[PDB]
Design brief:
heterodimer; A: alpha/beta; Rossmann fold; Beta-Lactamase; 5-stranded parallel β-sheet; 8 helices; 10 strands; 22% strand; elongated; B: alpha/beta; 2 domains; 6-stranded mixed β-sheet; 5-stranded antiparallel β-sheet; 9 helices; binds guanosine-5'-triphosphate; binds guanosine-5'-diphosphate; binds magnesium ion; protein-membrane adaptor activity (chain A); acetylation (chain A)
Chain lengths: 273, 298
């Protein structure tokens, strides 16, 4: 059931820089750069260079998207207004409103105003591209309300403030409990996964050449001087739970651990793993 | 009484000197270095390192006008009482023969005022060379740097602010300045054997530079001291930007357990165990008991 994403744009839009930063078989998500292909595809991400002039790029956008609505009119169209790290907010906003306006204005005159275009301000020196991908992938998971109800029963009953379900390779969150998501918590959790994976690549690969950094027993506890605790546990070979809680809730670590195994078996049954 | 050591940081303007210093000693990230101003004359910085060592860092603006003063009206000020010269080279530089004359004039003023000074050459910005060419270009320059360094030994390093190689060079430089650094390597050897670790790194708390390490079985990644310094340093900066200060970490899989923790008031430790019949509790109580003992030293 792996969600299918295609990524498209002109030479120098930033694509393989985006593919590199996010993914470097081994994701929860099936991802590819570019009327056959668009037949079984969830989402098409059109990347525009925002540091460059976009008039050329807006044109190709309208062609490739009208092309693919024809084939599969359920496909999600996602637009990455990209390399915005090169501009001032004044310039970010005006481009956003400008690409928004013309991309949508161009779609009225093809009589295709029943074709939704979501927008994202992305950058590779930024987490925006993770946030952006996390949003795109979440729309392609039909069992998202089940994952979100399971995290809710898990964190309620476990004294946990916030829980993200992560794709370990990409640092994309496929689900979170119902609490509002502060994007700084999301970034911090992504930076934890990097720390866990890069220390696991160096130590704990097996006496011989190699093995795998992430495995059934992959666990981390990070303690922050404001008594915040971050707690990562393997769920599946793709997916890791990361929890944010306080030291005080973490005193009841036995109850969290026992309940975690109910949540984990429940996640397995959802994915028929 | 803490040993005050004079480090000169010198190179042509824009080679990356302040950039390096701002990453190792001031908690910058590589992207932030794009906003640094040119350095006017010398920018003095006093780094309390372990509380028996102070590093008097001399960040010397590399404009032509500034260097010319350093060779003339300021020659005594600059080149007297120098323990370490760190000299930075822009690998992307067009003016190699002019870069060499400025380097050789620093060597000649160092040979006259501080001959027993320790010379390091940093072949810098290697992120802008193609990766298949890097080892090639660095060997060529090293060989030239050691010929043109005349009666003096230089130790060369290929550095970038965009990876671990910066931590490799500055770990190496600071190791040569730490007082009784062999005394410490023994006291850590002790702790490691008693606690029964595969490996123990000691880090300066502020910089996360490696100052001491124990292994048994030579491991595959000889570059791993720098990588850890870099990985953890970056996480420490995400913790203060995004939440609060880092305090401790525990990482595990089926092959290893790793503990990272405050140690002395001036250091962090990382213990690595390949899970025998040791509880978590025994390792934790050993790490706590060993603080008072390392505390003494400082
Ligand atoms: N690609 C790359 N750029 C670097 C590197 N180190 C520094 N830079 C950049 O190059 C410039 C160097 O500026 P500084 O660090 O202020 O240079 P400096 O050597 O102190 O210059 P002066 O004060 O004029 O002597 C900045 O844009 C840095 O971000 C590096 O390793 N790689
Ligand atoms: N500053 C900045 N540069 C970017 C970004 N994305 C890509 N680039 C740069 O844009 C250039 C083109 O990127 P690349 O991925 O090769 O384009 P592609 O043909 O779409 O793969 C490269 O020099 C990248 O470093 C970004 O978000 N910010
Ligand atoms: Mg400078």
């Amino acid at each position: 059931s792996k969600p299918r994403i295609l990524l498209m744009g002109l030479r120098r839009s930033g694509k393989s820089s985006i593919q590199k930063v996010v993914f470097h078989n081994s994701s929860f998500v099936n991802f590819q750069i570019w009327e056959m292909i668009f037949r079984g595809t969830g989402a098409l991400i059109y990347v525009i260079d925002a540091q460059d002039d976009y008039m050329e790029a807006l044109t190709r956008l309208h062609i490739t998207v009208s092309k693919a609505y024809k084939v599969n009119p359920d496909m999600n169209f996602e637009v990455f207004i990209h390399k915005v790290d090169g501009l001032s907010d004044d310039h970010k906003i005006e481009t956003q409103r400008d690409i928004h306006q013309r991309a949508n204005d161009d779609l009225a005159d093809a009589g295709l105003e029943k074709l939704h275009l979501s927008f994202y301000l992305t950058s590779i020196y930024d987490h925006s591209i993770f946030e952006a991908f996390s949003k795109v992938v979440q729309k392609l998971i039909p069992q998202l309300p089940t994952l979100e109800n399971l995290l809710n029963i898990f964190i309620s009953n476990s004294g946990i403030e916030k829980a993200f379900l992560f794709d370990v390779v990409s640092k994309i969150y496929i689900a979170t409990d119902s609490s509002p998501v502060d994007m700084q918590s999301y970034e911090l959790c992504c930076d934890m996964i990097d720390v866990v994976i890069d220390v696991s690549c160096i130590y704990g690969l097996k006496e011989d050449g190699s093995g795998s950094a992430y495995d059934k027993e992959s666990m981390a506890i990070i303690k922050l001087n404001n008594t915040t605790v971050l707690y990562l546990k393997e769920v599946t070979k793709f997916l890791a739970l990361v929890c944010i809680l306080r030291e005080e809730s973490f005193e009841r670590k036995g109850l969290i651990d026992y309940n975690f195994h109910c949540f984990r078996k429940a996640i397995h049954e959802v994915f028929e793993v | 009484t803490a040993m005050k050591k004079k480090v000169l940081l010198m190179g042509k303007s824009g080679s990356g000197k302040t950039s390096m210093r701002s990453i190792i000693f001031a908690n910058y990230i590589a992207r932030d270095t794009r906003r640094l101003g040119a350095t006017i004359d010398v920018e003095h910085s006093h780094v309390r390192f372990l509380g028996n060592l102070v590093l008097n860092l001399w960040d010397c603006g590399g404009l032509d006008t500034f260097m010319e003063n350093y060779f003339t009206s300021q020659r005594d000020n600059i080149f007297r009482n120098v323990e370490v010269l760190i000299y930075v080279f822009d690998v992307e530089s067009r003016e190699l023969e002019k870069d060499m004359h400025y380097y050789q004039s620093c060597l000649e003023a160092i040979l006259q005022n501080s001959p027993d000074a320790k010379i390091f050459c940093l072949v810098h910005k290697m992120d802008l060379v193609q990766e298949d060419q890097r080892d090639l270009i660095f060997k060529e320059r090293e060989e030239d740097l050691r010929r043109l360094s005349r009666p003096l030994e230089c130790a060369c390093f290929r550095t970038s602010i965009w990876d671990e190689t910066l931590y490799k060079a500055w770990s190496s430089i600071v190791y040569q300045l730490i007082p009784n650094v062999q005394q410490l390597e023994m006291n850590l050897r002790n702790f490691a054997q008693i606690i029964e670790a595969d490996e123990v790194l000691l880090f300066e708390r502020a910089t996360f530079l490696v100052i001491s390490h124990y292994q048994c079985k030579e491991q595959r990644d000889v570059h791993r001291f720098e990588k850890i310094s870099n990985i953890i340093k970056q996480f420490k900066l995400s913790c203060s930007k995004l939440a609060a200060s880092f305090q401790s970490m525990e990482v595990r899989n089926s092959n290893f357990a790793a503990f990272i923790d405050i140690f002395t008031s001036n250091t962090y430790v990382m213990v690595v165990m390949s899970d025998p019949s040791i509880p978590s509790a025994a390792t934790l109580i050993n790490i706590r008991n060993a603080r008072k003992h390392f505390e003494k030293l400082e």
